[PDB]
Design a protein around this ligand. Sequence first.
Ligand SMILES: *[C@@H]1O[C@H](CO)[C@@H](O[C@@H]2O[C@H](CO)[C@@H](O)[C@H](O)[C@H]2NC(C)=O)[C@H](O)[C@H]1NC(C)=O
Ligand SMILES: *[C@@H]1O[C@H](CO)[C@@H](O[C@@H]2O[C@H](CO)[C@@H](O)[C@H](O)[C@H]2NC(C)=O)[C@H](O)[C@H]1NC(C)=O
Ligand SMILES: *[C@@H]1O[C@H](CO)[C@@H](O)[C@H](O)[C@H]1NC(C)=O
Ligand SMILES: *[C@@H]1O[C@H](CO)[C@@H](O)[C@H](O)[C@H]1NC(C)=O
Ligand SMILES: *[C@@H]1O[C@H](CO)[C@@H](O)[C@H](O)[C@H]1NC(C)=O
Ligand SMILES: *[C@@H]1O[C@H](CO)[C@@H](O)[C@H](O)[C@H]1NC(C)=O
Ligand SMILES: *[C@@H]1O[C@H](CO)[C@@H](O)[C@H](O)[C@H]1NC(C)=O
Lengths: 303, 213, 224
Amino acid sequence: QCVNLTTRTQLPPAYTNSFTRGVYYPDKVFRSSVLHSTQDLFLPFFSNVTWFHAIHVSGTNGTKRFDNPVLPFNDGVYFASTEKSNIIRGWIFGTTLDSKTQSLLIVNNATNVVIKVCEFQFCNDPFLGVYYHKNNKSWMESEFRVYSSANNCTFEYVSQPFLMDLEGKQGNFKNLREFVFKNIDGYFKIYSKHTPINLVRDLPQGFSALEPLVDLPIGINITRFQTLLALHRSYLTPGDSSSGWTAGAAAYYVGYLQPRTFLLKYNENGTITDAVDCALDPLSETKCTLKSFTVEKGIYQTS
Amino acid sequence: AIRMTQSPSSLSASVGDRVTITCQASQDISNYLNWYQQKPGKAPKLLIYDASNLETGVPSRFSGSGSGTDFTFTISSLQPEDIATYYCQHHDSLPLTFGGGTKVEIKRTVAAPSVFIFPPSDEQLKSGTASVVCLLNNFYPREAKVQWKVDNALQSGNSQESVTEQDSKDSTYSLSSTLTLSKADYEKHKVYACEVTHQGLSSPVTKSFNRGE
Amino acid sequence: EVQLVESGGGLVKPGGSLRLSCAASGFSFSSYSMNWVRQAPGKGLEWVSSISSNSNYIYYADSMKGRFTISRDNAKNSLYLQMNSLRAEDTAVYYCASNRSPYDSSNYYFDYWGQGTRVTISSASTKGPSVFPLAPSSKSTSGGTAALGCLVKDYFPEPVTVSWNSGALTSGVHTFPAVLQSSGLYSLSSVVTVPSSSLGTQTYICNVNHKPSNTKVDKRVEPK
Ligand SMILES: *[C@@H]1O[C@H](CO)[C@@H](O[C@@H]2O[C@H](CO)[C@@H](O)[C@H](O)[C@H]2NC(C)=O)[C@H](O)[C@H]1NC(C)=O
Ligand SMILES: *[C@@H]1O[C@H](CO)[C@@H](O[C@@H]2O[C@H](CO)[C@@H](O)[C@H](O)[C@H]2NC(C)=O)[C@H](O)[C@H]1NC(C)=O
Ligand SMILES: *[C@@H]1O[C@H](CO)[C@@H](O)[C@H](O)[C@H]1NC(C)=O
Ligand SMILES: *[C@@H]1O[C@H](CO)[C@@H](O)[C@H](O)[C@H]1NC(C)=O
Ligand SMILES: *[C@@H]1O[C@H](CO)[C@@H](O)[C@H](O)[C@H]1NC(C)=O
Ligand SMILES: *[C@@H]1O[C@H](CO)[C@@H](O)[C@H](O)[C@H]1NC(C)=O
Ligand SMILES: *[C@@H]1O[C@H](CO)[C@@H](O)[C@H](O)[C@H]1NC(C)=O
């Protein structure tokens, strides 16, 4: 299988602030009403984060494009989504993403998830496209178009539909599915968090914590990754997914990580409620020097 | 709840004309709007979702665009099967709320009606009522004039009027007039006649009948 | 083939209770979710209630909070609504509709629609109809392609079906809007334009059926 799309209308990306998001529990240790200092990979506050809003805009030839370039992985990636109709499905993490090295794949199917490390032969423009059309009976259909061949599938794991599904009550457009991916010592750790919002698109200034979800013992090398978009096939033309189609206005944000020292405040139950970045500014340096969120007058010593 | 403004409420244009329906909301909601089409005497049908997506089985002549709080519903070229009602509805967090609704029509050539007359039945007169039927068939534009000359004397305040929708033959109207009278004043006159005046008619069309026939 | 068999309409006294039901046949009823919407005469469409898929989340209209009970049965694939209304304006036509998401992608828009059931809340009861033949009157026009019809006067409530040739003739039939009389009894005329050369060849019988009163009248229309 392989499909080409023309869709070469280009445009530069856009930048925003991370403000104060991107804090996750570093260990399985529980504490109560204490302040803890730690050193680990994090997202520095008020950062330089990319925003990939590059697809067709609702109008006359409104800059149609496929929004999925490959990006470097480095040490850690923070992935943020604001999307309601389930346009993004999964991801591919690898080094050469070819028929010469292994590559981990994550894909959701509106039910329990599919996870595997294997050796696939990805297409030029990876995607999976589905459509609901009554052909033999009304309202079914799953599809598959991601790759052409797959050899040496050395692991399999089907547990749950991820926290992407299973919304609660009231609320509704949560649209803050935040994920952090780490690869340490042959272990692929994934964190997740969901939080309701009240705005069409912006990162709110509130504070939230990210829980550990899974730690897969894979042990493969990742240097680049790519997202997977659930293409919608408007099956009114004989050119299938290689022809005219229409979808929404999905977009996402990607941020990177660097080693930092952070101060964390645990409440009386064991949930992080406020963090302080050590390397921000003189106030932050002083507040990291002595364990306190408030400081009195005088003159203090720093690095 | 968020307010929907639809413009125009109703517009009329001939076939092969670009048609624009503007739906505006009172809050920024991005692309979470749906367009529903309802033919007369039929359940509504969905046409466009996400305000810009064409479904399977929907004719390609229809389209949509816009985002934020303003959206446009586009008909590139009218064809003689698009006469229906259209609705725009948001889809965010409130369970549901529909807009006022917009009905479309076609401005075409003037047409002349056919005039039919039917005397009241004798059994109705036994019951105590006289219903004279005056029918106008396939007339256009909307308005028409109906008069009743009874023994060269006008009878008023004794008729009920009904108007049908655009037909699928030539997109015209049909009107029914039931002249309802009591036997007290019905028997003091001789010649009852229905007259029709219309833009497609150069003169009123008199259909007359006498007593005992 | 997706069929939505609906029932439960009727006319009741204010404060009564009714049992709306529509069964879905031809697809995975349990996998998808249904939804409800009602329409007053000459009014738009408004959502009523929702049941989602596993009945884990239930939504009710704010205007009708604590009035309607919604349930579904996957054992025989049907959807039920205990309608308890204390207000007269609830007189309207209802529709149970189907979604497009597998279970619940993101909230509920509509994909399929039913035929709609009639609900009336009034002190008045059902009354028998009256049939009057609008005879085929070419009169001025010569023989051929004359209009003949039948009128139902003093009947309640909607609808009455008028069919020619025992239902064989349906093309060219105009059903005038049900005029509202002083007493509230509905009244409507069905008129068809047919050739007059077949007046004496094919018998014309307008069958008028009133299901709420279950009155059937086969009025004969002879050439004239
Ligand atoms: C989405 O994909 C998953 C992965 O294949 C499907 O789960 C399997 O589905 C097949 C076919 O229905 C079953 O034979 C397997 O037993 C399923 N695996 C399990 C239960 O672990 C899933 O059904 C797909 N969902 C849809 C809606 O297509
Ligand atoms: C992935 O699968 C392919 C095909 O099964 C493997 O290709 C051959 O594998 C055998 C034994 O693994 C070697 O002796 C051959 O030299 C390989 N190449 C050819 C052309 O036959 C490949 O080795 C597998 N890779 C991994 C990492 O398991
Ligand atoms: C898609 O296009 C690229 C370059 O134009 C080509 O290398 C590739 O083989 C094409 N894939 C197809 C046609 O499936
Ligand atoms: C982050 O850096 C880019 C330059 O790399 C800059 O244009 C952008 O303004 C910065 N972020 C913010 C929120 O200003
Ligand atoms: C679904 O319907 C299509 C068209 O009728 C048919 O080609 C296809 O084989 C059907 N699916 C299955 C699993 O039979
Ligand atoms: C990356 O590959 C090299 C070569 O096999 C291996 O030595 C190294 O351990 C791999 N990286 C990790 C994190 O295991
Ligand atoms: C902490 O836990 C208690 C119950 O043990 C609960 O009432 C409270 O809401 C939780 N959160 C805070 C901030 O106290």
